[PDB]
Design an enzyme around this catalytic site. Sequence first.
Site, mmCIF file in Angstrom:
data_model
loop_
_atom_site.group_PDB
_atom_site.id
_atom_site.type_symbol
_atom_site.label_atom_id
_atom_site.label_comp_id
_atom_site.label_asym_id
_atom_site.label_seq_id
_atom_site.Cartn_x
_atom_site.Cartn_y
_atom_site.Cartn_z
ATOM 1 C CB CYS A 91 -16.600 -11.191 6.983
ATOM 2 S SG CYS A 91 -16.489 -12.913 6.327
ATOM 3 C CB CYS A 137 -0.078 -0.146 -10.974
ATOM 4 S SG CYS A 137 0.407 1.202 -12.031
ATOM 5 C CB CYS A 184 2.243 2.974 -8.794
ATOM 6 S SG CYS A 184 0.792 3.796 -9.458
ATOM 7 C CB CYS A 243 -13.630 -12.673 9.158
ATOM 8 S SG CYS A 243 -13.182 -12.368 7.425
#
Length: 235
Positions: free
Chosen positions: A38, A156, A153, A41
Amino acid sequence: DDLEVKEENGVLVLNDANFDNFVADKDTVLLEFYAPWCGHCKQFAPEYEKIANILKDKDPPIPVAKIDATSASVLASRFDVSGYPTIKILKKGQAVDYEGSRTQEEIVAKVREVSQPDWTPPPEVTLVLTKENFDEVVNDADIILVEFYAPWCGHCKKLAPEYEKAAKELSKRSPPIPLAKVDATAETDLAKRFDVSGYPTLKIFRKGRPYDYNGPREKYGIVDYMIEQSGAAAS
Ligand SMILES: [Cl-]
Ligand SMILES: [Zn+2]
Ligand SMILES: [Zn+2]
């Protein structure tokens, strides 16, 4: 995925292997997620280095870190990183989104603001349930959606933001429709009661009785399911 936390021009390098070790005892950490390919960046990299050096020299210092999201897939997943550079401030282990300019003055000011001991995130519309109030809340609600989640998790996290967004839209209704969550790792006794064996686990409660939620997990769909299931089928 090296265990060592290296420093590059004042900026710490975190990855899937060393991130939790490093941040677990830090009150405030500044994070940048980037990609090697990028250009934006690369242009920002000297400014981020100046930021790290300013924040190292305040009392007490605030660590400033970069993450290569292309090799740290677990972290990019956890923080729902899709574009670069993405800046986040971690305050007592929770992510705060930074949507402002990529300037030393703005980023340093916001970091200092969030680092304050009395700083709190915006309050969330989603109800927090624990063993203490679970029954009182659920039994009184005509309909309520409850998400049982584990903070550990990773898969999720992608749609945890959609759940809060859905909660906010559903609270502005007449009558309002509540969304709630249960940290199943903290609330082991509720989790066992509802046979939570995997994540995410969503349950709709209608007059205090649980039903598996098999609706969509995106904002618009959660909102529509809930509206339709509450008795507004044409809506
Ligand atoms: Cl009532
Ligand atoms: Zn009542
Ligand atoms: Zn509908």
